[PDB]
């Protein structure tokens, strides 16, 4: 599914990301735009053999099992395929574990490089929430 900006903002708010670990909703919408272009089916193969999956490009080296990332963990205890669903539940619940682990949203390189310290409020302008 390719979400609209306000559509994803509303779903992320429903699934409890607004101010989760102190990150306003706009941080999560900005991260999803630059990670996945709001496409739940986005995948990126890394040169290390891991793959990034879904709306928040969650990586198979640590967080999900894809059966093809040798030596990897599965800390969200999910198949990576669950992170590509139209239903953002699995992505959001894993994203909550990632952002809670110590480096906060810096775990998302696109958030660090493109969203962090910017006017992230802009991403929820015009949305019903
Ligand atoms: Cl893909
Ligand atoms: Cl694996
Ligand atoms: Na893995
Ligand atoms: Rh939902």
UniProtKB/Swiss-Prot annotation:
Transcription in keyword set: no
Listed under catalytic activity are:
Hydrolysis of (1->4)-beta-linkages between N-acetylmuramic acid and N-acetyl-D-glucosamine residues in a peptidoglycan and between N-acetyl-D-glucosamine residues in chitodextrins
Q: Which residues form the active site?
A: 35, 52
Pfam families linked: Lys
- GO terms of molecular function: beta-N-acetylglucosaminidase activity; identical protein binding; lysozyme activity
Q: What is its main location?
A: secreted
Lineage, top-rank taxon, reads Eukaryota
- Which compartments is it annotated to reside in? Secreted
User: Which residues form each disulfide bond in the chain?
Assistant: 6-127, 30-115, 64-80, 76-94
Q: Which GO terms describe its cellular component?
A: cytoplasm; endoplasmic reticulum; extracellular space
Name of the featured protein? Lysozyme C
GO biological process terms held by the UniProt record: cell wall macromolecule catabolic process; defense response to bacterium; defense response to Gram-negative bacterium; defense response to Gram-positive bacterium; killing of cells of another organism
Protein encoded by which gene:
LYZ
Q: What does this protein's UniProt record list under function?
A: Lysozymes have primarily a bacteriolytic function; those in tissues and body fluids are associated with the monocyte-macrophage system and enhance the activity of immunoagents. Has bacteriolytic activity against M.luteus.
User: What are the UniProt keywords, alphabetically?
Assistant: Allergen, Antimicrobial, Bacteriolytic enzyme, Disulfide bond, Glycosidase, Hydrolase, Secreted, Signal
Into which family does the record put it? Belongs to the glycosyl hydrolase 22 family.
List the lineage, top down: Eukaryota, Metazoa, Chordata, Craniata, Vertebrata
Summarize subunit and interaction data from the UniProt record for this chain: Monomer.
Q: What else is known?
A: Lysozyme C is capable of both hydrolysis and transglycosylation; it also shows a slight esterase activity. It acts rapidly on both peptide-substituted and unsubstituted peptidoglycan, and slowly on chitin oligosaccharides.
Q: Which PROSITE patterns match?
A: GLYCOSYL_HYDROL_F22_1 (PS00128), GLYCOSYL_HYDROL_F22_2 (PS51348)
